[PDB]
Amino acid sequence: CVFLNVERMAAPTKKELEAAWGVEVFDRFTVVLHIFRCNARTKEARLQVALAEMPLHRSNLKRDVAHLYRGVGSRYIMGSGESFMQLQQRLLREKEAKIRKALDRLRKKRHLLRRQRTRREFPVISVVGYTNCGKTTLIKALTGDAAIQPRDQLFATLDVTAHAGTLPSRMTVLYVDTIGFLSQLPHGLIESFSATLEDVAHSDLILHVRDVSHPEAELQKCSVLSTLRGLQLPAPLLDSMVEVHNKVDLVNVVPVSALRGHGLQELKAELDAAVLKATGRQILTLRVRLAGAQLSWLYKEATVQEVDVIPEDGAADVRVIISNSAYGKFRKLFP
Amino acid sequence: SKAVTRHRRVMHFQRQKLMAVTEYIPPKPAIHPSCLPGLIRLLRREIAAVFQDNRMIAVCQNVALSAEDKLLMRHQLRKHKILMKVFPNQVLKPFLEDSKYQNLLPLFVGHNMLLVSEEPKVKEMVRILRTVPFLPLLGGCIDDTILSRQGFINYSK
Amino acid sequence: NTRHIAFSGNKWEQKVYSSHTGYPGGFRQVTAAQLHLRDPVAIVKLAIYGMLPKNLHRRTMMERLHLFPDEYIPEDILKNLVEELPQPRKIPKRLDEYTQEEIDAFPRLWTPPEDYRL
Amino acid sequence: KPKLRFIERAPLVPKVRREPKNLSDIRGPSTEATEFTEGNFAILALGGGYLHWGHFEMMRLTINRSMDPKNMFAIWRVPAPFKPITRKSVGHRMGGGKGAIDHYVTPVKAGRLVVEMGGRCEFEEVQGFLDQVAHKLPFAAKAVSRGTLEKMRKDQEERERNNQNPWTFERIATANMLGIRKVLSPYDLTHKGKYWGKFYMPKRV
Amino acid sequence: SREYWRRLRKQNIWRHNRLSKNK
Amino acid sequence: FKNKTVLKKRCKDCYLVKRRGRWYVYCKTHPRHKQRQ
Amino acid sequence: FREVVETQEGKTTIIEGRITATPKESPNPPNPSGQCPICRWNLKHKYNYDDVLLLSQFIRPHGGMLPRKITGLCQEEHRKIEECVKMAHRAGLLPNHRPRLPKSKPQLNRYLTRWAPGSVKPIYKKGPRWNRVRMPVGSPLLRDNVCYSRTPWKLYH
Amino acid sequence: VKQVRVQFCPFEKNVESTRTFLQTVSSEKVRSTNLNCSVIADVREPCVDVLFGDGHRLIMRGAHLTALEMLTAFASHIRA
Amino acid sequence: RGRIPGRQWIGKHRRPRFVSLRAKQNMIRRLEIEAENHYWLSM
Amino acid sequence: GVIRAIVRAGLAMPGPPLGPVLGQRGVSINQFCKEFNERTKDIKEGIPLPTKILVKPDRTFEIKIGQPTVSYFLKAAAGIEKGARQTGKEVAGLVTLKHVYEIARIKAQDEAFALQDVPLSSVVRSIIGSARSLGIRVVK
RNA sequence: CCCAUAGUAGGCCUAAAAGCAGCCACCAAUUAAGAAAGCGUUCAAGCUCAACACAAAAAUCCCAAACAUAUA
RNA sequence: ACCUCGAUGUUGGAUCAGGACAUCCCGAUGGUGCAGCCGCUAUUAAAGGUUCGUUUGUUCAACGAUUAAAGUCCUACGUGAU
Ligand SMILES: Nc1nc2c(ncn2[C@@H]2O[C@H](COP(=O)(O)OP(=O)(O)OP(=O)(O)O)[C@@H](O)[C@H]2O)c(=O)[nH]1
Ligand SMILES: [Mg+2]
Ligand SMILES: [Mg+2]
Ligand SMILES: [Mg+2]
Ligand SMILES: [Mg+2]
Ligand SMILES: [Mg+2]
Ligand SMILES: [Mg+2]
Ligand SMILES: [Mg+2]
Ligand SMILES: [Zn+2]
Ligand SMILES: [Zn+2]
């Protein structure tokens, strides 16, 4: 076969190249679609890659049905007026409609799942970036999980998944690993994953993992920013987007090395600052009587950074990072 | 239909009859048979040695105490030469007849803890028991002479 | 006494009598208990009707049939009566109906523990 | 290498000649891999069926995840899929020649062991996930140890010896009584009525 | 011997733990 | 209540009771463990 | 049989227990060595739901069955007696063993009722002749009861 | 509950019910439930006298009562 | 309701057939006759 | 409630291992460390010391302390700072039975630790087992 | 069903990892307790356990009526 | 390729609708990541109801405005001797 490194070749171009070169012709769209189909394992991923495929099926409809024509039509005087190609196109449209309905249901279910994490006010950091730039490795380094398996191949992660981690402020932050983005690729392919990628929209912060070591890091930045704008992420979130330069070992921001684990502590510090300024969490000192379970309530509903106890007054001043909702609850519960 | 089918193929009625007639018949057993007719010895020696060596014996129901409370009671008992022993009733029952203790049969039921000694600090032990108004002193038998609670009180006094 | 018939098993609740008025949505399925509470003669009438031969004489036979829910019978029918057929099922006796002689005759099969609350 | 080995989708040298679906390789009792070898527990096939690479992946992943590599070892007792199964294009009318090779399977006959486990462990530790695998297998299957396998074989022998039925499928088929060979198959003379297609009736005597 | 049965109990607890690892 | 062909006790407080002709897994500490056959 | 009597006097409620007269097994069982009452008195397969004279001997005064550990019945006969008791109660043959304590319910005469009347759904769609939904009658636990008829019992109607 | 007194004579039989009642009521969980609630296990037919916080007495003569029945009555009177 | 697809007794989905005690007894009787035939042919 | 810690007598304010863990119940860290330092002055300095603090519901401290740990004590006796990795074949120090007896003399005397058995064997066996689990060989 | 003290928070490991993140050993005290089989803990703590003690659903309207006990 | 080619008239729409429930709404109930409002899921319920328009023959589909909802189907792709 021949892989023509073009975003997408038109039908006449594909036909002419096939006839001339006597072999199958693949473009960036087809190759990326093939790898997506191969790597997809979850039902959600399979559905999303099916939606992504739909344009390919429409393009290859004529070739995929050429073996079913049987020369029947326009002379059989009874039956629905639909011709062979009309029926095939109708079937393809019905399949696409089924896929879109299923994806809408999936989006509803994802919102249902997000309900709880939103209610409990877990800060959410969506790790986005170019394909193979180290998002999964960085999330593994931050969270400490071992089940995370950063592969070497492209588009390894096809599922939007949330992993919890701890910041230096003892605050628990939920990192959302997402699908990587690629340049010179049809926007529809990635946008077919919007059902699962809407978790990025509801994120409190976004972390762009720049593969600085890569020669075309600037082009990768342009591609990922354009892809995010196409995905229609909130403008405030895209503005607040933080950047981390991964793979710094190979060679205003925080340079980090996920595998070696070099700038992780710094990155965690800036992430802490970002989540404080984004989630509306106030780091404040609060004086509480050492009785009535106020201290335990503060522990369970907020991150108690430290406790300085005054036994003379039998009280304690707690430096705590408390959200507005938690602060209101505390003020009402313990006047 | 092929010989091997993904489903259980329907058998020809004669084959079905053959399979039904050649079914396994279990042997009926006429009348149902259902309604026709180291550590232990180590503690045996332990109990024999305890009974022989100890001069005075008593028993109680030290089960209603916490771990720490039982430990403290054990400490106070070890302050004297008295030793507290725990042994199963299942194997203590034969020991009464083995050692010829007929009057001791209706004393060891349920939880039972022996209080074996030779020098009676029963006065101070009863004093300790008094501040905890439970865990009653239970009948014992000193030197082959059964003593009731009043007997222990008189002996203490 | 057709009101006092007895079904074996859970037929009172499981047995369903089906009919259809003919009009759309006119399918009526009524349990045996409901049909009995509605009409105290329907159960026996339907049983006899289903057991009679399915020919043109069946309705004449049913006309000859007479059913009465309770002990009361019309005087003319009573005067017509000739013979009383034996009841197909012998009614088992209740403990209250068992005589002391029979209770004494039946042996006690086990010695209950004396110290049992029962 | 205690953990269960990976199984390839198709033989490295693909088969070129399409071959007939000889269902006799599923039909009847199994004559190979019927006894334990370097192990104490296994999954016994109480029926006939074809194992796909999907079934192989299920077995491998489940057993590998649920086993203890430092105290348990597992080994395949079934070869990698080799028998080619051909599927025609969807919407194809009958005729036009045999279809192109689509997948590879491995025939399994009733009475065969599919996976065998051993090591410093007892049955109870492994029977759980072996039964999970067996229930998810395409054919009836059961997690069986050496002791339990011998127990069931001896129970079958005891039932055969002490059956009170004067008439046995073996006797009637062999003697052609009632002319039942007109309704039976030549294979039935050896199956003795305990096998019907791919299904193995174990209670059948 | 007390220690004999202590070791036996330890081994039985180990066997129970191994069996219950999956349960 | 979720209809389940196989009924499993999901915690210590689940109890099996046959009511109205079918089995039920009832639970008070975790009502979400409630199951019907 | 012991009975617990509680008396409220003043504000000091007392409660004691008195052992009343207890029945004794009739002398000379026909088949000694029987491991349980039924197989001892030669009644393994010769009693039915309507044999109240037999069932009541294993009945709590309010109708509940008595435990195996007390009755002495083997497991199979205990199950048979329990099912026969349920059938007798549903048939109305035990009018003096009613639940302790009522609005008027319709009086539907029954007998040989396997299931509770309030738990069986109507058979609205009886299946085809080869898959008919049949109505159970009697209990399968009594399938081995001595059959004096040439045809076996029909447990399903 | 205010006070619970248990009296029995072991050498006389038919004392298992009262002895088990003692071993259960004196259980550290029960006593910790109400430290103020005072137990007195006297010994010398067998009886259990429970004086409640409301000045109400429950007298259980455990000669022919099982420990389960005695405990159930005790709990019912606690509920009041 | 209660349809057998296609024709009864021939297709893949046939009407179920069940052996009665009568049929079992008939087959057993014939088997006994044939066993006696074997005995008398064995000499 | 009882709170258990193995803090070192040297550093009385390490931070995380005491602050957050003790603050949940409600503690006076200043008083706690003052009392712990008083105990450190009473005993040798620079050695781990198990604590048996019980936080009463009345919000008061009753600190109970006893002998040093066993692992660090044995390592110091055998001249070891960091324990062996394998601990089944690795060994860094050897301790004689006489030394084991001598150290045990001042071991079975604590209340909270419950090491109160009259027989010498009961405690010598325990310490020998601890040493065997650690990378220490029992000479003769 | 009852019940649970404790060498010690076994070492290394790691910020700490304390039966429970991983590796090595897995001894040992109390009559009785795995250097811990599942929860839970950032880590602890708290929970247990082991140990003592005593089956299904589709579209006109279900589909003979019924029946468990009289001798093959 | 089993009935029908000495005809079983054809896709949609109008009209009238019959039926199933695998329920879209209205009814009752369990769970919930059910604080409340919105919801999601499941059991039971088919008595009643389930809109009007632009484009397109559209059955469908996109869009506008509504609704408590604008249900999935079968009925000769119900219904051309209407
Ligand atoms: N040398 C080096 N390689 C790194 C570094 N961070 C990540 N990588 C490698 O970059 C590749 C990225 O793998 P993942 O992190 O799984 O990829 P991803 O960012 O999730 O992207 P997708 O594979 O498209 O899902 C792997 O080969 C990593 O080992 C780093 O700091 N240095
Ligand atoms: Mg990834
Ligand atoms: Mg037909
Ligand atoms: Mg236990
Ligand atoms: Mg034809
Ligand atoms: Mg043909
Ligand atoms: Mg004609
Ligand atoms: Mg429904
Ligand atoms: Zn539960
Ligand atoms: Zn019996």
Q: What is the 3-state secondary structure (H, E, C) of A20-57?
A: HHCCCEEEHHHHHHHHHHHHCCCHHHHHHHHHHHHHHH
What DSSP element (H or E) covers A329? helix A324-333
Q: Got the DSSP string for A89-132? A: HHHHHHHHHHHHHHHHHHHHHHHHHHHHHHHHT--EEEEEEBTT
Give every CB contact of residue B70 below 8 A, 6+ residues apart in sequence.
B62
Query: Range of G77's domain?
Result: 1-157
Per the DSSP assignment, residues forming a β-bridge with D86 are D101
**Chain I nearest C-alpha distance from G54 (Å):** 34
Tokens matching residue A246: 């991964």
Please state, in angstroms and rounded to a whole number, the distance separating the CA atoms of residues A9 and A24. 13
Give every CB contact of residue H32 below 8 A, 6+ residues apart in sequence.
none
Tokens matching residue D135: 């229930």
C-alpha radius of gyration, chain B, whole number: 32
CA of G72 to the centre of ligand 10 (A): 9
What DSSP element (H or E) covers D146? helix D146-162
Which region, left, alpha or beta, applies to residue A39 given φ > 0 means left and ψ of -120 to 50 means alpha?
Answer: alpha
- Closest-lying ligand 1 atom to the alpha carbon of residue A131: 24
Nearest CA among I42, I35, B19, I24 for reference residue D176 = I35
Say if the Cβ atoms of H64 and G6 lie within 8 Å.
no
Q: How far is CA E22 from CA C115, D130, D165, F10, J57, in A?
A: 46, 12, 44, 16, 41
Nearest CA among A204, A327, A326 for reference residue A277 = A204
Exposure string over A81-116, b if 16+ CB within 10 A, otherwise e: eeeeeeebeeebeeebeebeebbeebeeebeeeeee
Name the DSSP class of B107.
Answer: G
* SS3 state at B92: helix
- Closest-lying ligand 1 atom to the alpha carbon of residue A151: 16
What residues in G contact H57, CB-CB < 8 Å?
Answer: 11-13
Please state, in angstroms and rounded to a whole number, the distance separating the CA atoms of residues J53 and C48. 89
Decide: G25 and C117 in contact? Cβ < 8 Å: no
The fourth-level CATH superfamily of domain J1-66 is Ribosomal protein L11/L12, N-terminal domain (3.30.1550.10)
Please state, in angstroms and rounded to a whole number, the distance separating the CA atoms of residues D115 and D117. 7
| Other CB atoms within 10 Å distance of the CB of residue G120 | 21
Decide: B84 and B113 in contact? Cβ < 8 Å: yes
What DSSP element (H or E) covers C31? strand C27-31
Please state, in angstroms and rounded to a whole number, the distance separating the CA atoms of residues G32 and J38. 83
Please state, in angstroms and rounded to a whole number, the distance separating the CA atoms of residues H48 and H5. 6
- Note the Cα D36 to chain centre separation in Å: 14
Please state, in angstroms and rounded to a whole number, the distance separating the CA atoms of residues J32 and J54. 11
Phi, psi of H69 (to 5 degrees): -65, -45
Nearest CA among H45, H43, H52 for reference residue H76 = H52
Tokens matching residue D14: 């693909």
User: Which residues in B have their CB inside 8 Å of a CB on I?
Assistant: 1, 7, 10, 13, 16-18, 20-21
Query: Which nucleotide is nearest to A109 if distance is taken from CA to C1'?
Result: L40
**How was this structure obtained?**
cryo-EM
> Which value, to the nearest 10 degrees, does the dihedral of the CA atoms of residues I25, I26, I27, I33 take?
110
CA of B12 to the centre of ligand 3 (A): 19
| Other CB atoms within 10 Å distance of the CB of residue G99 | 9
Tokens matching residue G122: 């109507």
Distance F1 CA to L24 C1' (A): 23
Decide: J12 and J40 in contact? Cβ < 8 Å: yes
Please state, in angstroms and rounded to a whole number, the distance separating the CA atoms of residues H40 and H29. 17
Name the DSSP class of D20.
Answer: -
Query: Range of H43's domain?
Result: 1-80
Decide: I35 and D168 in contact? Cβ < 8 Å: no
Tokens matching residue B41: 């010895």
Q: Up-side HSE of residue G89: CA atoms within 13 Å toward CB? A: 21
Please state, in angstroms and rounded to a whole number, the distance separating the CA atoms of residues H22 and B65. 12
Nearest CA among D40, A42, H57 for reference residue G12 = H57
Phi, psi of C12 (to 5 degrees): -55, -35
| Nearest residue (CA) to C1' of L12 | A80
Please state, in angstroms and rounded to a whole number, the distance separating the CA atoms of residues J40 and J22. 20
Tokens matching residue B114: 């022996």
Name the DSSP class of B56.
Answer: B
Give every CB contact of residue H29 below 8 A, 6+ residues apart in sequence.
none
Please state, in angstroms and rounded to a whole number, the distance separating the CA atoms of residues J69 and J75. 10
Please state, in angstroms and rounded to a whole number, the distance separating the CA atoms of residues C108 and J65. 72
> Which value, to the nearest 10 degrees, does the dihedral of the CA atoms of residues H17, H18, H21, H27 take?
-130
Determine the length of chain C: 118
Residues 57-96 of B, Cβ under 7 A from nucleic strand K = 63, 66-68, 70-71, 74, 85-90, 92
Please state, in angstroms and rounded to a whole number, the distance separating the CA atoms of residues C22 and C25. 8
A179 is in an annotated binding site: yes
Q: Which CATH number fits domain C1-118: 3.90.1180.10, 1.10.3720.10, 2.60.40.770, 3.40.50.2300?
A: 3.90.1180.10
> Which value, to the nearest 10 degrees, does the dihedral of the CA atoms of residues B103, B107, B108, B109 take?
130
Q: How far is CA D192 from CA B77, B82, D28, in A?
A: 78, 78, 10
A249 is in an annotated binding site: yes
Decide: B17 and I23 in contact? Cβ < 8 Å: yes
* Closest C-alpha residue for ligand 1 atom 27: A152
Nearest CA among J76, J55, J61 for reference residue J2 = J55
Please state, in angstroms and rounded to a whole number, the distance separating the CA atoms of residues B64 and B130. 15
| Other CB atoms within 10 Å distance of the CB of residue A178 | 25
For position H73, which CATH number holds? 3.40.30.10
Q: Which residue has the tokens 């602060």?
A: A327
Please state, in angstroms and rounded to a whole number, the distance separating the CA atoms of residues H43 and H27. 18
Please state, in angstroms and rounded to a whole number, the distance separating the CA atoms of residues G126 and G122. 10
Please state, in angstroms and rounded to a whole number, the distance separating the CA atoms of residues J138 and J140. 6
Determine the length of chain B: 157
> Which value, to the nearest 10 degrees, does the dihedral of the CA atoms of residues A87, A88, A91, A93 take?
-110
Tokens matching residue A47: 């559905």
Tokens matching residue G106: 């319709």
Distance A35 CA to K36 C1' (A): 46
Please state, in angstroms and rounded to a whole number, the distance separating the CA atoms of residues J114 and A256. 52
| Other CB atoms within 10 Å distance of the CB of residue C47 | 11
Question: Any long-range contacts for G145-152 (C-beta under 8 Å, 24+ apart)?
Answer: G145/G45, G145/G46, G145/G47, G145/G48, G146/G45, G146/G46
What residues in G contact C1, CB-CB < 8 Å?
Answer: none
Nearest CA among A248, A270, A274 for reference residue A259 = A248
Is the C-alpha dihedral spanning A160, A165, A167, A169 positive or negative? positive
Please state, in angstroms and rounded to a whole number, the distance separating the CA atoms of residues D104 and D10. 6
Tokens matching residue J8: 């070192």
Q: Which chains touch D (3 or more CB pairs under 8 A)?
A: A, B, E, I
Question: Any long-range contacts for F5-8 (C-beta under 8 Å, 24+ apart)?
Answer: F5/F37, F7/F35, F7/F37, F8/F35
* SS3 state at G125: coil
| Other CB atoms within 10 Å distance of the CB of residue C61 | 13
Is the C-alpha dihedral spanning J107, J108, J114, J120 positive or negative? positive
Tokens matching residue H14: 């038919």
Please state, in angstroms and rounded to a whole number, the distance separating the CA atoms of residues G58 and A46. 64
Q: Which residue has the tokens 């074997």?
A: I38
Please state, in angstroms and rounded to a whole number, the distance separating the CA atoms of residues I31 and I25. 10
Nearest CA among J131, J119, J46 for reference residue J94 = J131
Please state, in angstroms and rounded to a whole number, the distance separating the CA atoms of residues J12 and J36. 7
Decide: C62 and C47 in contact? Cβ < 8 Å: no
Nearest 5°: CA angle at C74, between C70 and C79? 120
Phi, psi of B118 (to 5 degrees): -120, -35
Q: Which chains touch C (3 or more CB pairs under 8 A)?
A: G, H
Please state, in angstroms and rounded to a whole number, the distance separating the CA atoms of residues A101 and B138. 79
* SS3 state at B116: strand
Q: Which amino acid is at G59?
A: I
Decide: A262 and A248 in contact? Cβ < 8 Å: yes
Decide: A257 and A222 in contact? Cβ < 8 Å: no
Whole-angstrom distance between the N-terminal and C-terminal Cα of chain G?
43
Give every CB contact of residue J32 below 8 A, 6+ residues apart in sequence.
J18, J22, J53, J61, J63
> Which value, to the nearest 10 degrees, does the dihedral of the CA atoms of residues A92, A96, A102, A103 take?
160
Q: Does D116 touch chain E (CB under 8 A)?
A: no
- Is G51 near strand K, with its CB below 7 A from some atom of it? no
Work out the burial of residue E19: count CB atoms within 10 Å of its CB; fewer than 13 is exposed, 13-18 middle, 19 or more buried.
middle
Please state, in angstroms and rounded to a whole number, the distance separating the CA atoms of residues G117 and G86. 11
Q: Enumerate helices (H) and strands (E) in chain F, giving the number of each.
A: 0, 4
Q: Does J31 touch chain A (CB under 8 A)?
A: yes
Ligand 1, CB within 6 Å, residue ranges: A 131-137, 150-152, 154-157, 180, 246-247, 249-250, 257-260
Please state, in angstroms and rounded to a whole number, the distance separating the CA atoms of residues J82 and G81. 73
- Is J114 near strand K, with its CB below 7 A from some atom of it? yes
Q: Which amino acid is at A10?
A: A
A135 is in an annotated binding site: yes
Q: Which residue has the tokens 């191994």?
A: E18
Exposure string over C88-109, b if 16+ CB within 10 A, otherwise e: eeeebebbeeeeeeeeeebbeb
Tokens matching residue J78: 């055998």
Nearest ligand to residue D94 Cα = 6
Q: Got the DSSP string for D74-132? A: EEESSPPP-EEEE-PPTTPPS-SSPPPEEEEEEEE-BTEEEEEEEES--HHHHHHHHHH
Q: Which residue has the tokens 């057709």?
A: C2
Give chain G's largest Cα–Cα span. Answer: 72
Which region, left, alpha or beta, applies to residue B5 given φ > 0 means left and ψ of -120 to 50 means alpha?
Answer: beta
Work out the burial of residue C5: count CB atoms within 10 Å of its CB; fewer than 13 is exposed, 13-18 middle, 19 or more buried.
middle
Structurally, how many domains does chain H consist of?
1
Tokens matching residue C27: 């399918």
* SS3 state at B79: helix
Query: Which nucleotide is nearest to A77 if distance is taken from CA to C1'?
Result: L10
Determine the length of chain E: 23
Resolution (A): 2.7
Q: Up-side HSE of residue B56: CA atoms within 13 Å toward CB? A: 18
Tokens matching residue B103: 């009057």
Class of the CATH-defined domain B1-157: alpha beta
C-alpha radius of gyration, chain F, whole number: 9
CA of D95 to the centre of ligand 6 (A): 14
Q: Got the DSSP string for G7-47? A: EEETTEEEEEEEE-----PPSS-SSTT-SSHHHHTT-TT--
Nearest CA among A227, A239, A214 for reference residue A188 = A227
Tokens matching residue B117: 């000694």
Please state, in angstroms and rounded to a whole number, the distance separating the CA atoms of residues G4 and H17. 14
Q: Which residue has the tokens 């017509």?
A: C80
Q: Which CATH number fits domain J67-140: 3.40.190.80, 1.10.10.250, 3.40.50.1820, 1.10.260.40?
A: 1.10.10.250
Name the DSSP class of H72.
Answer: H
Tokens matching residue A262: 């070099």
Which region, left, alpha or beta, applies to residue I5 given φ > 0 means left and ψ of -120 to 50 means alpha?
Answer: beta
